[PDB]
Amino acid sequence: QEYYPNFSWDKVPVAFHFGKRDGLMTKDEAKFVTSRSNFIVLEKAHGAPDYEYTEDAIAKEARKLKKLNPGMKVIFYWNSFLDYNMYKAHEVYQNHPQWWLRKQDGELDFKNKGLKRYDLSNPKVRDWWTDVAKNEIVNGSTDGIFMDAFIQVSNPANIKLWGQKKYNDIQQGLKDLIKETREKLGDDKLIVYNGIRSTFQRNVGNNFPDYTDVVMIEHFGHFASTSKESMLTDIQEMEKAGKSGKIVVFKAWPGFAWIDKEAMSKPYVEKQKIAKNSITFPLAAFLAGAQEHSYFIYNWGYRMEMGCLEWYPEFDKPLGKPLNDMVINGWVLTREYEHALVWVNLETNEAKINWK
After folding, report:
1. Would you say which domain of life the source belongs to (predicted)?
2. Which of 83, 88, 102, 161 is deepest in the core (most CB within 10 A)?
3. Rounded distance, CA 147 to CA 78, Å?
4. Which fold has domain 16-317?
């Protein structure tokens, strides 16, 4: 835990996860982020279109943030499944068509807009993929890697496309990729992966605990995880992961997301007002199960302009250390901090934070 970001219970622990379009962060934006958190994940296409390649922009942005805050942990986003076109490594991957994953019917496997999906069962793809992470991170400005799209790899709909045998090899290839990543990165670098996800159809927990330091709860109380059963599972997974020593990133939403076309057409001040009015329930749910090194993120997207730099009075109130563990009473969760008493009813979507 010596290479973890410095954690404190003094106020609500928050983290950042975004990519800024139209160049790197300004000095004011960099000061805002580094003075309020020690933990930021920089997304794909950060700095676009001013920076052609994500590797350059993230490396430069990490240096800028670390000048203001030497204790800042800056994470390099590197999708484990999808071949996005704004990296240098994308050009290398294009020159290896023999690597490209193909479905059962022999057709190339890709998502919409020609986004190829990696064949993680191929050791040559894994060695190239981990080489990209190593060359960017070790002896570099970043302190770790964000391996995304783990859930998409294990999606049972892939068995129809790949067949059971190919699906099993790809699942095992993902496990090897994580182990190879830790081998090349070393012991002093953080490994983040998109983990916990609770839905009616599938429940995914901290299912890759080996060699990893941070697990994300991306979809709390939103998308397909709005049910009381899903929300309780997400909060319990945070509590279980945190008690195991994991950093947990608890991503909450203001009742809407950037994929909502009608909500995105609202005035920005209306988005702020909705977000300001909708923070109590997800924050109380976070504080109910939050452990040491648990972090709260509250916005409506992964581009910086989608509320990522908004601030709320709840984030300035004293919090203090937790005095007890989470108490579950049916669908009602309670937690007591030194300066806050937390109450949340997942069934009725009601919550109250009694600051004191």
Report:
1. Bacteria
2. 83
3. 6
4. TIM Barrel (3.20.20)
